Coordinates of C-alpha atoms and ligand atoms in Angstrom, one line a residue:
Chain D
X4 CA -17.9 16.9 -61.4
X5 CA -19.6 17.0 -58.2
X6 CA -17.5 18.4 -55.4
X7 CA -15.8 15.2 -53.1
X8 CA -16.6 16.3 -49.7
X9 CA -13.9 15.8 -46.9
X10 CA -15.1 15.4 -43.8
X11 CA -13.4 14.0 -40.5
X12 CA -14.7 13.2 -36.5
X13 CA -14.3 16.5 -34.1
X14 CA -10.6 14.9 -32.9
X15 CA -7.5 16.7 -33.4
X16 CA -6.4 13.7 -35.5
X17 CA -9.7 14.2 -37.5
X18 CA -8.6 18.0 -38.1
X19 CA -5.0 16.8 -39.6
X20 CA -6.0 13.9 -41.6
X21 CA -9.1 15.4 -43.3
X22 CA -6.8 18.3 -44.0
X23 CA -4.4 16.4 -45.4
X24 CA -7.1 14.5 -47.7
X25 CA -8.1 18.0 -48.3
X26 CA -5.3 18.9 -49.5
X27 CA -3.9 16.4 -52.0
X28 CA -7.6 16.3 -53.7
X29 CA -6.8 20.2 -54.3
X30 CA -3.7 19.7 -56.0
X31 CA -4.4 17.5 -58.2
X32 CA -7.0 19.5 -59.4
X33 CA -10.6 17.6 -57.7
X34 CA -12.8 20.2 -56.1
X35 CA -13.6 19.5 -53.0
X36 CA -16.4 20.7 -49.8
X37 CA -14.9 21.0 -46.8
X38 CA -16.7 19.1 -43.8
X39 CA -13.5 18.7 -41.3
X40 CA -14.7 17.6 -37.9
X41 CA -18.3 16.9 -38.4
X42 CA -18.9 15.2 -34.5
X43 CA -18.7 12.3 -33.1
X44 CA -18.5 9.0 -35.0
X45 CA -22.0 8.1 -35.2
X46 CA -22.9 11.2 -36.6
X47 CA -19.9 11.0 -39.3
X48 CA -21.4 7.3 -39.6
X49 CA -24.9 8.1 -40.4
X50 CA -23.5 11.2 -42.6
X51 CA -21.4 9.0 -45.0
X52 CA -24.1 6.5 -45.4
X53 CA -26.6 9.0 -46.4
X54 CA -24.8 10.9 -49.0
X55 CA -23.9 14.1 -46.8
X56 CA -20.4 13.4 -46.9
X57 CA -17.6 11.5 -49.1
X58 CA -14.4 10.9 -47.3
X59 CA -13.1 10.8 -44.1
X60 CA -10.4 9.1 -41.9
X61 CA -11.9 6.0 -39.9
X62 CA -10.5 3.5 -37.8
X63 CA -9.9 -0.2 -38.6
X64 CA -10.4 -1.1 -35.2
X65 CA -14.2 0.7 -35.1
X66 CA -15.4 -1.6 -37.6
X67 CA -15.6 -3.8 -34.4
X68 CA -18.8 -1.6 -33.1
X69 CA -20.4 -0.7 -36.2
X70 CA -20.9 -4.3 -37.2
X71 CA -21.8 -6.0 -33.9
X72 CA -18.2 -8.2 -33.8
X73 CA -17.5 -5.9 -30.4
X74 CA -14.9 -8.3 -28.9
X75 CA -13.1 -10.7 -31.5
X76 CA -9.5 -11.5 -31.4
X77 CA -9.6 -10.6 -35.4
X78 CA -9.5 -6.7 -34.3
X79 CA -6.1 -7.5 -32.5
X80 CA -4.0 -8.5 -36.0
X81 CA -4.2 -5.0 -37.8
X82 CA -3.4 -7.1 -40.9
X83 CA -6.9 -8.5 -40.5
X84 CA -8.7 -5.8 -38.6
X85 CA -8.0 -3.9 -42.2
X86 CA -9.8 -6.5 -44.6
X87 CA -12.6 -7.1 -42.5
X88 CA -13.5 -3.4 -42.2
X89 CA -12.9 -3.2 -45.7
X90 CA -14.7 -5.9 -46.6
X91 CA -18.1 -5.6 -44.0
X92 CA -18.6 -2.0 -45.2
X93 CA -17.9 -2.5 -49.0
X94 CA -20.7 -4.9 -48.9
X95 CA -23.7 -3.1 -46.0
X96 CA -22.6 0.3 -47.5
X97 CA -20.7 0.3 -50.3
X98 CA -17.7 2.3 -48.6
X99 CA -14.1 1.7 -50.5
X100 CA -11.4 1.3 -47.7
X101 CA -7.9 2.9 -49.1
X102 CA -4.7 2.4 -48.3
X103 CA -4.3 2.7 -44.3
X104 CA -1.7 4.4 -42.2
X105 CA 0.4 2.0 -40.0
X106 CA -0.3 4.1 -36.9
X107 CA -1.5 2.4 -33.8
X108 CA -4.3 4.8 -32.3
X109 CA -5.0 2.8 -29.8
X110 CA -4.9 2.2 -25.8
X111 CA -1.3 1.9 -24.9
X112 CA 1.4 3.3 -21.8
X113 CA 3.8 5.7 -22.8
X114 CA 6.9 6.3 -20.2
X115 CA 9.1 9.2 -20.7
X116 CA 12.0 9.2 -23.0
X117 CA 14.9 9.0 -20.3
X118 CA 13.0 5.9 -19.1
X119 CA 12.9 4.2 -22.3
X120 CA 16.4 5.6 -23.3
X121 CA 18.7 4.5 -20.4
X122 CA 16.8 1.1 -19.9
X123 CA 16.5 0.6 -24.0
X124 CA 12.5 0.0 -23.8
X125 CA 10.9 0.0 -27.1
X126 CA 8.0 -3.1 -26.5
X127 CA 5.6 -3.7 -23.6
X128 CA 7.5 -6.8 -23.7
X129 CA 10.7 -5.0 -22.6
X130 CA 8.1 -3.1 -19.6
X131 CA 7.0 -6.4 -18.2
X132 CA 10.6 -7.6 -18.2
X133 CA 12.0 -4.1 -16.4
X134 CA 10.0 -4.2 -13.7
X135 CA 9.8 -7.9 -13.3
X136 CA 13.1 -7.1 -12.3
X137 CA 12.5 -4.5 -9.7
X138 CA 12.4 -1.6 -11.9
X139 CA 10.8 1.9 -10.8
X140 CA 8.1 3.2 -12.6
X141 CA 4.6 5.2 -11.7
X142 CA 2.0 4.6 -14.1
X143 CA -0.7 7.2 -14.3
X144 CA -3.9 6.2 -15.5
X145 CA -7.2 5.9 -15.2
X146 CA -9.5 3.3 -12.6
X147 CA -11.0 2.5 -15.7
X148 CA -7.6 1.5 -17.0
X149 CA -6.3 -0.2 -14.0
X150 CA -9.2 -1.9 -13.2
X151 CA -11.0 -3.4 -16.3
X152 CA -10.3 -6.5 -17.4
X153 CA -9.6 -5.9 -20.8
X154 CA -6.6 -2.8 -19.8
X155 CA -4.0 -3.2 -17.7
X156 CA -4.7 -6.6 -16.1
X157 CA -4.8 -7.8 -19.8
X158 CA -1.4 -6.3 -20.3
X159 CA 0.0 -7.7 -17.3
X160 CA -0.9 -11.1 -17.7
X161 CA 0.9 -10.9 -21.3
X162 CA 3.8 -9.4 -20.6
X163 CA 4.5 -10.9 -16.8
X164 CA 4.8 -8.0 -15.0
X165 CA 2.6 -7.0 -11.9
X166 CA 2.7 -3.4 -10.6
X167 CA 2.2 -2.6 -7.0
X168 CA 0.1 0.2 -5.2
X169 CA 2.9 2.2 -4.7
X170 CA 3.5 2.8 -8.4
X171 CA -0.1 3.5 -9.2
X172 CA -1.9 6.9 -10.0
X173 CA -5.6 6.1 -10.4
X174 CA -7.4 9.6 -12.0
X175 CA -10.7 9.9 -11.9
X176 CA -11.5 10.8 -15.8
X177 CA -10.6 8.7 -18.8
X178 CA -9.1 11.4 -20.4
X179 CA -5.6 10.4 -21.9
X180 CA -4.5 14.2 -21.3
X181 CA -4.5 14.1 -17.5
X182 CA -2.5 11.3 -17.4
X183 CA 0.4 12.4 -19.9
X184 CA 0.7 15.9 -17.9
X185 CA 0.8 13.5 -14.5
X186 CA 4.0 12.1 -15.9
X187 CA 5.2 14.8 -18.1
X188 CA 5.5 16.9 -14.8
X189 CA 6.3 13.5 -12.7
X190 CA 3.2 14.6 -10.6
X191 CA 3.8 12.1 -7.3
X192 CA 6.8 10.5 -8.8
X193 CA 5.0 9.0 -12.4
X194 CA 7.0 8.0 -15.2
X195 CA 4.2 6.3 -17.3
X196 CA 1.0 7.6 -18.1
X197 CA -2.0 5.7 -20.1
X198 CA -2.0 7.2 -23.4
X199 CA -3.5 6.6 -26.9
X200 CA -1.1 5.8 -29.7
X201 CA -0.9 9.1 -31.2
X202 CA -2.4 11.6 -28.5
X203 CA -1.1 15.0 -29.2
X204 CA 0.7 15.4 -25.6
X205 CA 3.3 12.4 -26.3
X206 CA 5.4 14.4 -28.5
X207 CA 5.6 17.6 -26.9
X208 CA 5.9 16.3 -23.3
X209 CA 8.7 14.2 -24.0
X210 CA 7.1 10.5 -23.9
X211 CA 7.6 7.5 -26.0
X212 CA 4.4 4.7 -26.4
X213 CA 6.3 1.5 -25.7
X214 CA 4.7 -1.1 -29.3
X215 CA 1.8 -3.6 -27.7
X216 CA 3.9 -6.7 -29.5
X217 CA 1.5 -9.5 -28.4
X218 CA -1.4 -7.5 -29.8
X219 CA -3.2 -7.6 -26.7
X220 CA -5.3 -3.9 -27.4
X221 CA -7.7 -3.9 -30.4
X222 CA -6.0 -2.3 -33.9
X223 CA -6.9 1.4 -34.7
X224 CA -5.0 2.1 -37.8
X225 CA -6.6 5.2 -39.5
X226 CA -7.6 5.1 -42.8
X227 CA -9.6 7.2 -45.8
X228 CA -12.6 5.2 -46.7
X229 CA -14.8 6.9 -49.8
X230 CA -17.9 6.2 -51.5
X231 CA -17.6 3.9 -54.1
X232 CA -20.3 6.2 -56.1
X233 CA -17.9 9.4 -55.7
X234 CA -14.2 7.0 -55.7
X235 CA -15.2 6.0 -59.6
X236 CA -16.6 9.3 -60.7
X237 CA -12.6 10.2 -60.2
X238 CA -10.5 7.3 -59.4
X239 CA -7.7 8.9 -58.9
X240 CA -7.6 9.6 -55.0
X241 CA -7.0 6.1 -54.3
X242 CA -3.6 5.8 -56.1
X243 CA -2.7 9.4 -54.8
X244 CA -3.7 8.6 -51.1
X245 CA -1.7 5.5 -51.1
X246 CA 1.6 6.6 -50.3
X247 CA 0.7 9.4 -48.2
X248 CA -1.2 7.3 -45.7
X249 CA 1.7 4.8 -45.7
X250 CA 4.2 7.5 -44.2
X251 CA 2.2 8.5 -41.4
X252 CA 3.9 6.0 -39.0
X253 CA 3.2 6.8 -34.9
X254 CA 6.2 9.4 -34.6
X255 CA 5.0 11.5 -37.7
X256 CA 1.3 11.8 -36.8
X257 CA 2.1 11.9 -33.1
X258 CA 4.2 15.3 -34.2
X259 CA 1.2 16.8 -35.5
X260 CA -1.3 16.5 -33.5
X261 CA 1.0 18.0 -30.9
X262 CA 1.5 21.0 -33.3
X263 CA -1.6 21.5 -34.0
X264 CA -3.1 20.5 -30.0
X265 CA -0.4 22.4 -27.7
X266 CA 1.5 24.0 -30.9
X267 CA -1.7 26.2 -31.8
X268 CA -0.4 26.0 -35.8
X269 CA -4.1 25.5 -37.9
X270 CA -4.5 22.1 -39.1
X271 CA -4.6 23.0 -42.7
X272 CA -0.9 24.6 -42.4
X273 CA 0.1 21.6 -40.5
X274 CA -1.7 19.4 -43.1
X275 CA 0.7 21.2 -46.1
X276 CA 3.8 20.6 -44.0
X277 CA 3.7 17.0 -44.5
X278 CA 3.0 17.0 -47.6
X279 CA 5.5 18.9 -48.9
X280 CA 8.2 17.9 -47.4
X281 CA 7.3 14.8 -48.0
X282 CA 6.9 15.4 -51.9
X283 CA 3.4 14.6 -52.1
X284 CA 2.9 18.6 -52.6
Chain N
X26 CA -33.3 15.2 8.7
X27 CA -30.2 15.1 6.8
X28 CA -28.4 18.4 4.9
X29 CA -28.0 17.5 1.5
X30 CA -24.2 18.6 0.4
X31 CA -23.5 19.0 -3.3
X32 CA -21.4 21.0 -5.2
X33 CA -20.2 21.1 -9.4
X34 CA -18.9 18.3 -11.4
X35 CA -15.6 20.3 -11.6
X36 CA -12.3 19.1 -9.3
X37 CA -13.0 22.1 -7.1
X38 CA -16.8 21.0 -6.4
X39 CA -15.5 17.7 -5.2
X40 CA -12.8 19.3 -3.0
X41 CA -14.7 22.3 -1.8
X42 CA -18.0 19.6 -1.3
X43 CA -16.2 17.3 0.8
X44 CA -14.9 20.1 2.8
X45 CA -18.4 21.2 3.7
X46 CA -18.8 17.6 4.2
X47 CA -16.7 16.6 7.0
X48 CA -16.7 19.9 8.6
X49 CA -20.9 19.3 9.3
X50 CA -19.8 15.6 10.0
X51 CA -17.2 16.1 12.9
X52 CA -19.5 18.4 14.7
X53 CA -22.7 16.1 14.9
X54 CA -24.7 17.3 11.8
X55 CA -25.6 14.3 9.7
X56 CA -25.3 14.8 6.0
X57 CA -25.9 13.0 2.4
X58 CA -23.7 13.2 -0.1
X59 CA -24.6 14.6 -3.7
X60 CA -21.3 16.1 -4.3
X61 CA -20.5 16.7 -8.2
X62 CA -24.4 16.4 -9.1
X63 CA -23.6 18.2 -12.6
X64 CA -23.0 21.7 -13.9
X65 CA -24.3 25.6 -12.5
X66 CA -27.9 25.2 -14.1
X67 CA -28.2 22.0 -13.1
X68 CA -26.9 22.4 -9.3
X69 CA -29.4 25.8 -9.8
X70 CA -32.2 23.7 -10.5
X71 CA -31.7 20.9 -7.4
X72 CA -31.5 24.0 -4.8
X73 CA -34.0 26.4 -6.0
X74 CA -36.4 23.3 -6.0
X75 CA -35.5 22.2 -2.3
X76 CA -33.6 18.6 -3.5
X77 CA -30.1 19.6 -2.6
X78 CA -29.2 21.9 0.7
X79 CA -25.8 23.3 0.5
X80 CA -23.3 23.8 -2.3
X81 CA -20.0 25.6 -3.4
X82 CA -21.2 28.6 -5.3
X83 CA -18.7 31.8 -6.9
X84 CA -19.8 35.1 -6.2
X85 CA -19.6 36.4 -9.9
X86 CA -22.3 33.6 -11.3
X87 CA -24.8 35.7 -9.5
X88 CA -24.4 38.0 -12.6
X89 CA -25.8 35.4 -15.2
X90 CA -28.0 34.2 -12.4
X91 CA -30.0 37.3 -12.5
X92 CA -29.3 39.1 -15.9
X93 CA -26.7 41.5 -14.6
X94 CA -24.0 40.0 -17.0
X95 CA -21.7 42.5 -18.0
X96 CA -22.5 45.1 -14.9
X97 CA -18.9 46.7 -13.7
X98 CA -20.4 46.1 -9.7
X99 CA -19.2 42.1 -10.2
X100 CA -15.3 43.4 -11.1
X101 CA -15.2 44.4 -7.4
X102 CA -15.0 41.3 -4.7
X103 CA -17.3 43.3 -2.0
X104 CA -19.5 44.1 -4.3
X105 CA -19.9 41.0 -6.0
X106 CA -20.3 39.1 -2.6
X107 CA -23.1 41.2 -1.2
X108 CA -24.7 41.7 -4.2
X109 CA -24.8 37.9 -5.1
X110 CA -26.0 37.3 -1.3
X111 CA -28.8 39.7 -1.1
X112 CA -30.3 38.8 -4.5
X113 CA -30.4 35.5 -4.0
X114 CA -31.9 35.8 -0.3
X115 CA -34.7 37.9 -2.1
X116 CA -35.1 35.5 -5.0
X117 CA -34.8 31.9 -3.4
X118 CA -34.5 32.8 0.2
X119 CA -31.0 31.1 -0.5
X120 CA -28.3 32.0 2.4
X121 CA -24.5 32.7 0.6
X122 CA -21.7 32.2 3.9
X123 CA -18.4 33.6 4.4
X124 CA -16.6 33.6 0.9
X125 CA -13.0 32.3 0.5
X126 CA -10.4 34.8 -0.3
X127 CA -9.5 32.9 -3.8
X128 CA -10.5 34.6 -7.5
X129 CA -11.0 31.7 -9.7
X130 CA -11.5 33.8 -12.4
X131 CA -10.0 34.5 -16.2
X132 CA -5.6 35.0 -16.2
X133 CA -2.7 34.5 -17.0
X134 CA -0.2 32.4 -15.6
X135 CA 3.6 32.2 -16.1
X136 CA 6.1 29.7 -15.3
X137 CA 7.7 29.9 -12.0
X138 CA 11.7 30.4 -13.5
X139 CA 9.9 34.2 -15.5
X140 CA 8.2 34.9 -12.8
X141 CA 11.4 34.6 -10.0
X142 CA 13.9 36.1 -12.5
X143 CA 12.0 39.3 -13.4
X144 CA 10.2 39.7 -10.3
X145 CA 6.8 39.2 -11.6
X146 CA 3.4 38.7 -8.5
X147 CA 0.8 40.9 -10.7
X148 CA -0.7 41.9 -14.3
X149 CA 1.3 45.4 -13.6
X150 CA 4.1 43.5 -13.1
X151 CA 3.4 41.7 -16.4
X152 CA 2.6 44.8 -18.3
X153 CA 5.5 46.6 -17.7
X154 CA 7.9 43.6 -18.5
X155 CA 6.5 43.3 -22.2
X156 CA 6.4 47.0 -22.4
X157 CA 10.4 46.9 -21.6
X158 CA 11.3 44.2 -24.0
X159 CA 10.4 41.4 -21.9
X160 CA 10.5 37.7 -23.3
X161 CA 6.8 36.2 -23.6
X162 CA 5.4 33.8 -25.7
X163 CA 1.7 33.3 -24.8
X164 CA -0.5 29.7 -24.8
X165 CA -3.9 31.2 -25.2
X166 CA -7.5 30.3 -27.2
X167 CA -8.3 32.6 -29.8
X168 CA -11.8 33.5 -27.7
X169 CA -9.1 35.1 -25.2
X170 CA -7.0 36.7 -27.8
X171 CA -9.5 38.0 -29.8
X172 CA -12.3 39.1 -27.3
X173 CA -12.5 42.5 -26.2
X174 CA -13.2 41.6 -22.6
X175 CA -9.8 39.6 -22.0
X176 CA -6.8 40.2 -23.8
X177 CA -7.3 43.6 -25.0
X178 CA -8.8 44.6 -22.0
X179 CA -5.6 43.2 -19.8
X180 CA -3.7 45.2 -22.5
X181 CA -5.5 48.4 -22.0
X182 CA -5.9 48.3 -17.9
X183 CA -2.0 47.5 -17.9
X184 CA -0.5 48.9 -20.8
X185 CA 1.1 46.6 -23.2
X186 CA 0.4 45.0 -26.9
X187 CA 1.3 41.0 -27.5
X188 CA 2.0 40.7 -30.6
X189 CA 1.3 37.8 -33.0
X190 CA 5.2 36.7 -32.2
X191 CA 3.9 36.7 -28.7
X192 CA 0.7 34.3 -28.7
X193 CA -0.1 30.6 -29.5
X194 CA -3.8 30.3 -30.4
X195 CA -5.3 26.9 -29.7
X196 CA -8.4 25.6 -30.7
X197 CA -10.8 25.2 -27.5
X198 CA -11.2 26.9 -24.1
X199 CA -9.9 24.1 -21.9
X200 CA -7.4 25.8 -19.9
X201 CA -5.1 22.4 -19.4
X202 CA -3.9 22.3 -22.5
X203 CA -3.1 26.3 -22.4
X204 CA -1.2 24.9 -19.2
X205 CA 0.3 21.9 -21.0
X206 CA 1.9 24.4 -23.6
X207 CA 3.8 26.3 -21.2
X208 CA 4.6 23.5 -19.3
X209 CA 6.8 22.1 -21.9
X210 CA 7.4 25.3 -23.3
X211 CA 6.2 24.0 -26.7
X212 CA 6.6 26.6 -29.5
X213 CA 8.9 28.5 -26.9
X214 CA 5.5 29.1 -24.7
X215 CA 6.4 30.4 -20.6
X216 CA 2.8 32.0 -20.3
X217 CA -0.6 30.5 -20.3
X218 CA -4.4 31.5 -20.1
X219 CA -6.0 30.0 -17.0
X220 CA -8.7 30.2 -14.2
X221 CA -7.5 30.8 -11.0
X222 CA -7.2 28.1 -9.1
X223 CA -7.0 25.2 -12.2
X224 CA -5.7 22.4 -10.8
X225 CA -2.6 22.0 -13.3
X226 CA -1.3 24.9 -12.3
X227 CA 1.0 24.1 -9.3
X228 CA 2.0 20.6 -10.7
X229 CA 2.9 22.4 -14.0
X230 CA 5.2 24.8 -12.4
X231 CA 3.0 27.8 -12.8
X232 CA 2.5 31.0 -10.7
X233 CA -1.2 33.2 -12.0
X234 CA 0.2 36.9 -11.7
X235 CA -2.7 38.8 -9.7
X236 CA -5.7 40.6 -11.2
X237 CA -4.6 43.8 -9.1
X238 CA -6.9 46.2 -11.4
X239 CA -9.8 43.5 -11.4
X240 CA -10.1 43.7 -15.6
X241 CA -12.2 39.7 -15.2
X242 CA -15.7 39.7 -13.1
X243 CA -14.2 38.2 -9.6
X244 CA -15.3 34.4 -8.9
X245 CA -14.9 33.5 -5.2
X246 CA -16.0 30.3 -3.8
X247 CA -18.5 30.3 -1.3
X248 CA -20.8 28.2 0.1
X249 CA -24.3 28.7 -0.4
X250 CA -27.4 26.9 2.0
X251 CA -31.2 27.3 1.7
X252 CA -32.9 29.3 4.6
X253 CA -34.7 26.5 5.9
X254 CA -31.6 24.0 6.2
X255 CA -29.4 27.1 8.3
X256 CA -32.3 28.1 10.9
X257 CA -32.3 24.6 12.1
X258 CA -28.5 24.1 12.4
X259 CA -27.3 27.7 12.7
X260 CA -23.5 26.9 14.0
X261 CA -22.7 25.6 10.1
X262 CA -22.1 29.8 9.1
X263 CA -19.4 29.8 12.1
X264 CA -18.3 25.9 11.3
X265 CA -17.1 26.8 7.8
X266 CA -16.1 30.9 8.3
X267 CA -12.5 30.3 9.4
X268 CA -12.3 27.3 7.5
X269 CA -12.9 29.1 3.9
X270 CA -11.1 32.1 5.0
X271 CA -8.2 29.7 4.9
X272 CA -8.8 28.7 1.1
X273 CA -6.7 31.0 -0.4
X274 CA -5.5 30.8 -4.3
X275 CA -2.6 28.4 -3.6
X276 CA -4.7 26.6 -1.0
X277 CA -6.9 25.9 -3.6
X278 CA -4.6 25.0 -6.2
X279 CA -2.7 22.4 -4.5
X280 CA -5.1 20.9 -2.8
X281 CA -7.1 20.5 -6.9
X282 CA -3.9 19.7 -7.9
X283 CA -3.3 16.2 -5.8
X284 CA -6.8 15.5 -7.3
X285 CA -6.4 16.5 -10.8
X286 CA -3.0 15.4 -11.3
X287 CA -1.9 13.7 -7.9
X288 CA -4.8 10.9 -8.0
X289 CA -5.6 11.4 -4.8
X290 CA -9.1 10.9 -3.6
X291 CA -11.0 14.6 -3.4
X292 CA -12.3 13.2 0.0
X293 CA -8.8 12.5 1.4
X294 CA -7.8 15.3 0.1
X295 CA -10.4 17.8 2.5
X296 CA -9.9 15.8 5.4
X297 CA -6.0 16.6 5.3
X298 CA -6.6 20.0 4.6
X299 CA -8.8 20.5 7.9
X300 CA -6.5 18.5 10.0
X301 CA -3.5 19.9 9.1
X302 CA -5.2 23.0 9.9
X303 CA -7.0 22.3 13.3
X304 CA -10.6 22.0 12.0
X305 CA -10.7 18.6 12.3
X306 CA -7.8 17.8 14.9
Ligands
CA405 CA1 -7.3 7.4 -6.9
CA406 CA1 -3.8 29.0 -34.0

């Protein structure tokens, strides 16, 4: 029996969830070669297609780019952004989607827990709503993000809600970590920051991603997709995977990336964590 | 005849270009703009061939410049200055001005509460607190931990030992999320690894303890014009002398941190700087 290799994208989630795969694989006795955070996703794309690798954690949502259906509204019900990854690249490539995790990695505004706490904000629907009402908040995020149609004048058009210059911190950079250390440290006054779902900074910096209800961001829900060549060699790791993918909600993989990202814990340790206090281990 | 300004792709080229900027602008020299053109060997390349006029440049780059890497001549800032500005006059006729006082360089930063209570401004400071039983828990990469020219040597020059108790190893060299660690004091973290003037360090709450036995080659921002461009507008050298004099550390970190974190336009940013400060009005 030919070694399954793991492999992931260079992310920190990519690190936690190909260690986890890693992991269960091990104990159940499947040998494994490890290949955690390849690159970037076309290289992990043209890797898996070729034979160089076996399993790794994609997105339902990037199905979207890899088969030239950039822009449907399909990707917005993660229901049916699974089954259309699932089916597209069982039949170009013969890759077996498994069970995936119900985590949203995807564009989203997090506000800090004292904001969502006292003013009982859990939905975007409940942020349009707020400041509708004259509410105070700061969003930090990017032009990009401010700007574009398909960000934040999407989201305000959804949820009614239109938010002024004066509560607007436009970075430069996309990068999501800017913007959650803007309103961790309330950097000219924010209390929001552009985030994705599970970014390692939300957790540690006190922040809580209000749920895009009205599905108006494409689904990223992560899940282990295999070659069908190496999934019925030992069937097995679809059955075992199942239920270990279905606890990683948003608050458990949010808590560790952040301690693996800011925590400095290896991902591996972080990895057998879960699953033993979970039972899987 | 226009001077062409450039500078990094970094938040301190952008702030530190734009100075140069309006300071030429405001007393008749006109300009264009190619600040943040990309990295050192690119920025190397557009001067040394003539397409870009003036930049910010540090001092201690001179040693990778001209194969003097590791030479003990770049730990002292005199040193470093004039023997980055004659080679470089010899080599490419290039023209280095009056440095700014601020060491942009490799440390070690600590939250502002450690540093008030225990009366910390310096690494001997620092050295002396762990040596007594001080209370430090350090967010560092394992390149700084590990590598005989940072953390061991700080340990040596100023006698003390960190030990595994002490230190949070993350994964990459990005200073902001060594900052973001002791920020939120995750995993009990109140010290981080920085560069000197990282723009997350004054929105973070974060005070760098000085270098006082220079252990890290010195990097001080200066900027850097071609021969040709100076002789035929000679008054720039006494234009931006007092002006980068006045760029100290915490200058420099404020003023990167209403970019960085603050959102603030780098341009906007300069010209409040030199008018606050009477080089503008
Ligand atoms: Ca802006
Ligand atoms: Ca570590």
């Amino acid at each position: 029996s030919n070694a399954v290799a793991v492999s992931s994208k260079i992310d920190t989630e990519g690190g936690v969830l190909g260690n986890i795969i890693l992991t269960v694989l091990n104990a159940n006795g499947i040998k494994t070669t490890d290949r955690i955070q390849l690159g970037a996703t076309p290289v992990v794309r043209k890797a898996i297609t070729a034979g160089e690798i076996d399993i790794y954690p994609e997105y339902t949502g990037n199905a979207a780019f890899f088969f030239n259906k950039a822009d449907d509204p399909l990707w917005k019900d993660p229901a049916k952004a699974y089954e259309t990854a699932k089916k597209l690249d069982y039949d170009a490539n013969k890759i077996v989607w498994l069970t995936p995790s119900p985590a949203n990695n995807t564009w989203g505004i997090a506000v800090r827990k004292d904001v969502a706490n006292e003013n009982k904000l859990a939905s975007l629907s409940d942020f349009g709503k707020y400041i509708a009402g004259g509410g105070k908040v700061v969003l930090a995020a990017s032009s990009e993000f401010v700007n574009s149609a398909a960000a934040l004048p999407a989201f305000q058009t959804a949820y009614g809600f239109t938010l002024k210059p004066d509560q607007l911190i436009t970075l430069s950079g996309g990068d999501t970590a800017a913007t959650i250390a803007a309103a961790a440290n309330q950097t000219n006054g924010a209390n929001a920051a552009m985030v994705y779902g599970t970014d390692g900074g939300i957790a540690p910096s006190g922040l809580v991603v209000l749920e895009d209800d009205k599905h108006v961001q494409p689904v990223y829900q992560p899940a282990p997709i295999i070659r069908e060549e190496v999934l019925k060699k030992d069937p097995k790791i679809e059955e075992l995977l199942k239920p270990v993918f279905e606890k990683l909600d948003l608050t458990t993989l949010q808590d560790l990336n952040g301690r693996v990202q800011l925590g400095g814990e290896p991902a591996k340790a972080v990895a057998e964590d879960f699953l033993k206090k979970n039972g899987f281990l």
